[PDB]
Design a protein around this ligand. Structure first.
Ligand SMILES: Nc1nc2c(ncn2[C@@H]2O[C@H](COP(=O)(O)OP(O)(O)=S)[C@@H](O)[C@H]2O)c(=O)[nH]1
Ligand SMILES: Nc1nc2c(ncn2[C@@H]2O[C@H](COP(=O)(O)OP(O)(O)=S)[C@@H](O)[C@H]2O)c(=O)[nH]1
Ligand SMILES: [Mg+2]
Ligand SMILES: [Zn+2]
Ligand SMILES: [Zn+2]
Lengths: 113, 187, 73, 929, 185
RNA sequence: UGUCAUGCUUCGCGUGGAGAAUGACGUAGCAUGCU
RNA sequence: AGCAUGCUACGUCAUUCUCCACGCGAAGCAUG
């Protein structure tokens, strides 16, 4: 009995864009757990495929952190009125265990077909 | 500095008491001569102490200078010895094979461990027992490191010459092992 | 008498080393073996046998020492 | 036999397998097997008891049993569905064991069953557990694994020490016969991972779900996601398996052509020194799904926690490449228009290729610093020297610097006959006495110095479990945090003895004084600054010792050059002087045993431990057998004090220099240059302190292994049960350092496991009721940890235990303890072996020492050492101190009688009357000072 | 005491005896006390100087004695060792050691190391007829408190002499240095 | 040929404090001189 | 009464030894 991590996750709403500039507000949903010293954004769910960066609001004076993103992967959820297609991006430099956590939690929450 | 004030003022200092011996009276001059003699004595003491201190300071400075000047004539000798060693070692390098291997290298760097293998002109083989000799250096010519070597000489642990005909199974117990055999690279 | 042979062997090997038996590898190896075997011996008879062998090594070299003078002292 | 045969036929299926009933399905089978477990209740890598399985064994034709088992199970209806669905996706992989799902009638009920087909008896978790928790009295599983795969025969174990790496080296060969099998496993796992990613399965790979052929057969904890995006989690698989990859030499088929053991070896270009591409290929072939980034050359690493990570893989991969490509990298320069051969790099087997940043071609004239640097390195000493083939040793021989071979011998030793006669007259050295002579000067022949050097065959390439080492390093850095360190200037360096040798070749021109006075402070500072962006190889000279001992074995010492020591002092001395000035710490270097220091040290060790016992151990072949990873770690923790003075590149280049001129280097043994595999050098500036770090690391590793291999369903205490569940996470599931748990584990170790460390000597006071329950380390755990991490077998005959604390340690630094009464209070005092003192008296190493009248200070010092024997219950021990006092009186009488005859002066002023009275020596053990 | 300037420190001391007497004449006692203190200080200074001299002299004497004895020890390191060795060997009082030492003293030394095995080659050099008479009786040879079996005997010049020849009757007929080979019994 | 650290003992040269003794400037008691 | 000289006491500066604290050298012993 060697199970995947039981840790549950929490949601945040944030935004991002194709490049360092051009970032537009409220166009992505981040997943995190705060049990660390603070919030750690583990992955990003969105509807567009051209995203390549992320501007997450930093908990510091006049602080804006630009975290990079990985290539997308396309998932088909069906929680809302009907089928929906959303793409997932993992924060670049994320070990496999946290990826497993995010994928497991998301796949349990939404049937994913 | 101290000799002069002493030999000058102590004359008067003692003359003050010489006058006391002369007179006997002048008991007030007893205190006056006390003052004179003690003033001269204290001034002397001070000057003599200063002179002795100065002498010690000068002696220490001279000793330091000599020691320093002796530590600069041994830096030169070691410098010369190192330069001579480097040039002596340098003149022992065959710049024909060495240049070949250095030029065949990509950027000029080559591992050190291969330089003796590919450019050395002599080989030394140290053999503990007789099976090792039979399996490594047997005969008057052998092969090691992808090259052919010809035995030039053999000696034993006592630096005594051993003939190649003495190295046999029967006579092995009568040799002083290990045997050091020096061989020359065939062309 | 064990602690007496263990010291006589030391003195004897020093005497041999002064006569320059170190210049022969085989003889020096044998002498070292005997000397180090006497110092780790828990039985006296073995020590005495090895003492006999080492003293024979000393006595072989005739011109090195003048035994008659030493034994008449 | 009505339903039983029906079940047997069912299990046989349609595979045409002849099955014998090993354990009936109705009447199942139980076993004792090693499992890797992590749920929300327990966590560890421990040996449990299974029930559920029912096993049948396949018999081949001719009615002979083979190593094939059908393993049927009884599952609840839900896991049955889950496992069948997950298997219907991975069935096509060649690395997945065949499964068969069927329902059977038992007691009027339909019960599901999952049957796996043709599994070897053991799994890889059993192999790893057997080789990582070794106990020579319980080796049944290891023996059966070795015999079953034709690694050896069953007659091989009737030998004296079939498991000892030192007494029986051939055992290595036996283990190396498990290499190919392991390698094949490492290949199949990769296939499995690929399959998972392609099928969209996410799960954790454990060792106990793969058999010894390499088939995977458990899918109970896997989940399902979109096809093409899976995630295999492999951290406790590779990490737990790492120490076994190097012991069985799993990558020896990478040296042959086409990676086939039958075909001949690969012939590499002799001028090739750079193997970055090959290392990347090996990593991408065997460790494809290992997350953390790998740098073949550690010059590009980021922290000191990354250098260890990457150097582990470099240690593994360097065994595949030719041995002639490691060492200084030579280049040709011109000075005064004349060619020179100089080192301009280094190829470390553990750190990759390093190139000097300050390389100057076309020089004009050389100063003192340049001459020192060029004369120190072995470039032109080896280039201008004969080739050497020394058949007396198995160590890579570089060159011969002369036309002769030197044979050095040791001399017998001198005999002080007067003292021996005095002792004999005092009733000593009789037959049947408890005090006798055991320490002598032993002589050696010409072959001593090379036979001693040939003991570097005990140093083997040891790959380490990295996820565990990265935690032990953080717990070991808390034992060194009350000190201060950094870099000093050439003005602030203290040199005790300046009349010592300066290594080679510098010993042909003067002593260490000649170079400290010929070299201004600017020169020394410039050389130190030069070493921070360049690598300077040096040569160490091996010399024989002339000292008293109780053993017939020669002793050698390694003298390092002057360039190494000069620059190592300016780097380490500030911290080394602070470790030796602190009182009450774990490391007790710099503390004295006089004026009540022994009592203070023992009282500090005792501390407040419940149910205390004392233990002590020893390290076999300590200097020779130390792995090259723990020495790098020891040098990396000592350099954590340079956070403000040195940058990352400066620290890396200091590490490179230390490796190049201490760890692996060229040694001068009899006028010939050989290559040193590794270990520890006696003459380096940080020997005792590196040994202390190594000692603490081994002890902490023993404790971690003891705690993580306990059941965890039986630890009644609930605090120590969570401390185990969190330790597993901090090792194999947390990536970054958890700062609030290293403190908790450190406190836990300090309250129940108190240490006193001095170089490679250690004493421990531990909680006895926690050890017998497996919650703190024992002696068996040290024996287990010294086998897979130190390549050495430690026997339970040089280790001691003490259940009574009023008697003190059995031995520490060659001294015994005694609780005496000293003026209204009881105190612990040390005393030596009487034979050592008497031997020091009787046998001297110089002819001038055999005249007592010239040597009265010798006997005063010896009596100071021998005083505590006065308080011993045995009467033959208390009569050594009095012997020395009486002999001192006799020596003084003789000296006075001689002075009156040779001269006409009686020494007017004497205070020697105090030396032959016992009140001068008591004051050395009284706390007042 | 007994210094050249010490006397004053005593003379004024005697005057101090009068200082107590005569009812302590204030002027006389005080001036006498001042002079006494001056004299005592002078004598103390001279005594300190003499003590320093004596310390230096003793150090020099000790250094000279050390050097002389060190040179003596290092010069005679060949006769002392042999004399000690033979004193100890006589004290041991063994049978084999005394046998071989006596034979060596009479000229019958061995040629190789004495073997401690059942069957090994021992060669000895019998110089005269008399040593042969005492040691060998027939086909046996008693040496180092053990019996050896003669396998061959050779003359000074290479020749195989026979045991029947070697007797008194023909004692002068052979060159006398006689090598005897034997095997341990 | 003779390495790195730590501790202790003995001897010898140098710097800073305290106790006793001798010499010049200041304060206290008594006596003599000028007033 | 004020100033000066003499005798007896207390307060600052230079020497003579006597114990402590601290540096630099030389020899020795022990430990890892
Ligand atoms: N290879 C093999 N393994 C065996 C055998 N007998 C018992 N076991 C144990 O049984 C587990 C399989 O269990 P399985 O993978 O289905 O799930 P689980 O029980 O671990 S939960 C393995 O871990 C082993 O230790 C045998 O003959 N061959
Ligand atoms: N420089 C120096 N180091 C020494 C000496 N003796 C011992 N050590 C060190 O102490 C540890 C244990 O010793 P070792 O494992 O070898 O066994 P041992 O029976 O001799 S104590 C080794 O790391 C050695 O480096 C010595 O004289 N000089
Ligand atoms: Mg399992
Ligand atoms: Zn790295
Ligand atoms: Zn630094």
């Amino acid at each position: 009995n060697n199970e995947l991590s039981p840790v549950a996750l929490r949601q945040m709403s944030c935004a991002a864009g194709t490049t360092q500039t051009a970032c537009t507000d409220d166009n992505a949903l981040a997943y995190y757990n705060t049990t660390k010293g603070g919030r750690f954004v583990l992955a990003l769910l969105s509807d567009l495929q051209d995203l390549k960066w992320a501007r997450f609001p930093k908990s510091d004076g006049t602080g804006t952190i630009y975290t990079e993103l990985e290539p997308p992967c396309r998932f088909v959820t069906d929680t809302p009125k009907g089928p929906k297609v959303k793409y997932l991006y993992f924060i670049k430099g994320l070990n496999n265990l946290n990826r497993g956590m995010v994928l497991g939690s998301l796949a349990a929450t939404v049937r994913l077909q | 500095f101290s000799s002069l004030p002493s030999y000058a003022a102590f004359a008067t200092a003692q003359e003050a008491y010489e006058q006391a011996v002369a007179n006997g009276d002048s008991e007030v001059v007893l205190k006056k001569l006390k003052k004179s003699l003690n003033v001269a004595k204290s001034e002397f003491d001070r000057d003599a102490a200063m002179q002795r201190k100065l002498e010690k300071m000068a002696d220490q400075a001279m000793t330091q200078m000599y020691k320093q000047a002796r530590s600069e004539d041994k830096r030169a000798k070691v410098t010369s010895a190192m330069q001579t060693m480097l040039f002596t070692m340098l003149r022992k390098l065959d710049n024909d094979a060495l240049n070949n291997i250095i030029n065949n290298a990509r950027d000029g760097c080559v591992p050190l461990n291969i330089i003796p293998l590919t450019t050395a002109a002599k080989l030394m083989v140290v053999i503990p027992d007789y099976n090792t000799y039979k399996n490594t250096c047997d005969g008057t010519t052998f092969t090691y490191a992808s090259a052919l070597w010809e035995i030039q000489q053999v000696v034993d642990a006592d630096s005594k010459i051993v003939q190649l005909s003495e190295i046999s199974m029967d006579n092995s117990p009568n040799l002083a092992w290990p045997l050091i055999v020096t061989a020359l690279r065939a062309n | 008498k064990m602690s007496d042979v263990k010291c006589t062997s030391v003195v004897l090997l020093s005497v041999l080393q002064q006569l320059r038996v170190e210049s022969s590898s085989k003889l020096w190896a044998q002498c070292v073996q005997l000397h180090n075997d006497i110092l780790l011996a828990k039985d006296t008879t073995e020590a005495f046998e090895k003492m006999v062998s080492l003293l024979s090594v000393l006595l072989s070299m005739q011109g090195a020492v003048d035994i008659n003078k030493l034994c008449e002292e | 036999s009505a339903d039983a045969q029906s079940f047997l036929n069912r299990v046989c299926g349609v595979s045409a397998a002849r099955l014998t009933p090993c354990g009936t399905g109705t009447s199942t089978d139980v076993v004792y097997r090693a499992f890797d477990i992590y749920n929300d209740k327990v966590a560890g890598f421990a040996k449990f008891l299974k029930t559920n399985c029912c096993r049948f064994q396949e018999k081949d034709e001719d009615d002979n049993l083979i190593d094939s088992y059908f393993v049927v199970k009884r599952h609840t209806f839900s896991n049955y569905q889950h496992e069948e669905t997950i298997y219907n996706l991975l069935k096509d992989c060649p690395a997945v064991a065949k499964h068969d799902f069927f329902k059977f009638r038992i007691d009027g009920d339909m019960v599901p069953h999952i049957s796996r087909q043709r599994l070897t008896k053991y799994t890889m978790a059993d192999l790893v557990y057997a080789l990582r928790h070794f106990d020579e009295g319980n080796c049944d599983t290891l023996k059966e694994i070795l015999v079953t795969y034709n690694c050896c025969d069953d007659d091989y174990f009737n030998k004296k020490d079939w498991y000892d790496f030192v007494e029986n080296p051939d055992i290595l060969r036996v283990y190396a016969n498990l290499g190919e099998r392991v390698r094949q496993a490492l290949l199949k796992t990769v296939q499995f991972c690929d399959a998972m990613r392609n099928a969209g399965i996410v799960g954790v790979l454990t060792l106990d779900n793969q058999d010894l052929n390499g088939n995977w057969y458990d899918f109970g904890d896997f989940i399902q996601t979109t096809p093409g995006s899976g995630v295999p989690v492999v951290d406790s698989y590779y990490s737990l398996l790492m120490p076994i990859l190097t012991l069985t030499r799993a990558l020896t088929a990478e040296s042959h052509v086409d990676t086939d053991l039958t075909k001949p070896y690969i012939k590499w270009d002799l001028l090739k020194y750079d193997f970055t591409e090959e290392r990347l290929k090996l990593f991408d072939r065997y460790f494809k799904y290992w997350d953390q980034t790998y740098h073949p050359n550690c010059v590009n690493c980021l922290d000191d926690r990354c250098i260890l990570h990457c150097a582990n893989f470099n240690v593994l991969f360097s065994t595949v490449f030719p041995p002639t490509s490691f060492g200084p990298l030579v280049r040709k320069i011109f000075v005064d228009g004349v060619p020179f051969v100089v080192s301009t790099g280094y190829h470390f087997r553990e750190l990759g290729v390093v190139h000097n940043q300050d390389v100057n071609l076309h020089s004009s004239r050389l100063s003192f610093k340049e001459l020192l640097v060029y004369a120190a390195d072995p470039a032109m000493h080896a280039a201008s020297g004969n080739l050497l083939l020394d058949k007396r040793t198995t160590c890579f021989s570089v060159a011969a610097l002369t036309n002769n071979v030197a044979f050095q011998t040791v001399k017998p030793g001198n005999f002080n006959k007067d003292f021996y006669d005095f002792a004999v007259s005092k009733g000593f050295f009789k037959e049947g006495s408890s005090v006798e002579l055991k320490h002598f000067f032993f002589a050696q022949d010409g072959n001593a110095a090379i036979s001693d050097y040939d003991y570097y065959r005990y140093n083997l390439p040891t790959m380490c479990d990295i996820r565990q080492l990265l935690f032990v390093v953080e717990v070991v850095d808390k034992y060194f945090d009350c000190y201060d360190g950094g870099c000093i200037n050439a003005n602030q360096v203290i040199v005790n003895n300046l009349d010592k040798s300066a290594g080679f070749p510098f010993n042909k021109w003067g002593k260490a004084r000649l170079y400290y006075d010929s070299m201004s402070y600017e020169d020394q500072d410039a050389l130190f600054a030069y070493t921070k962006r360049n690598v300077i190889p040096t040569i160490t000279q091996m010399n024989l010792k002339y000292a008293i001992s109780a053993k017939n074995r020669a002793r050698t010492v390694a003298g390092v050059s002057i360039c190494s020591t000069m620059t190592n002092r300016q780097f380490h001395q500030k911290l080394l002087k602070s470790i030796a000035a602190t009182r009450g710490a774990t490391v007790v270097i710099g503390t004295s045993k006089f004026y009540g220091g022994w009592h203070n040290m023992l009282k500090t060790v005792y501390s407040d431990v419940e149910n205390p016992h004392l233990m002590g151990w020893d390290y076999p072949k300590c200097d020779r057998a130390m792995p090259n990873m723990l020495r790098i770690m020891a040098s990396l923790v000592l350099a954590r004090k340079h956070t403000t003075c040195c940058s990352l590149s400066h620290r890396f280049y200091r590490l490179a220099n230390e490796c190049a001129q201490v760890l692996s280097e060229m040694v001068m043994c009899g006028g010939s240059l050989y290559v040193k595999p590794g270990g520890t050098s006696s003459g380096d500036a940080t020997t005792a302190y590196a040994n202390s770090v190594f000692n603490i690391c081994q002890a902490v590793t023993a404790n971690v292994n003891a705690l993580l291999s306990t059941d965890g369903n039986k630890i009644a205490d609930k605090y120590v049960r969570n401390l185990q569940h969190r330790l597993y996470e901090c090792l194999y599931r947390n990536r970054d350092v958890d700062t609030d748990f290293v403190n908790e584990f450190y406190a836990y170790l300090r309250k129940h496991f108190s240490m006193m460390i001095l170089s490679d000597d250690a004493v421990v006071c531990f909680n006895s009721t926690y050890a017998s329950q497996g919650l703190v380390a024992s002696i068996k755990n040290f024996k287990s940890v010294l086998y897979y991490q130190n390549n050495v077998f430690m026997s339970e005959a040089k280790c001691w235990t003490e259940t009574d604390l009023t008697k003190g340690p059995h031995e520490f630094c060659s001294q015994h303890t005694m609780l005496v009464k000293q003026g209204d209070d009881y105190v612990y005092l040390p005393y030596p072996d009487p034979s050592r003192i008497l031997g020091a008296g009787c046998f001297v190493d110089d002819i001038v020492k055999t005249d007592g009248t010239l040597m009265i200070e010798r006997f005063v010092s010896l009596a100071i050492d021998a005083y505590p024997l006065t308080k011993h219950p045995n009467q033959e021990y208390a009569d050594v101190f009095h012997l020395y006092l009486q002999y001192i009186r006799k020596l003084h009488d003789e000296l006075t009688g001689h002075m009156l005859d040779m001269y006409s002066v009686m020494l007017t002023n004497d205070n020697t009357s105090r030396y032959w009275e016992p009140e001068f020596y008591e004051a050395m053990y009284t706390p007042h000072t």
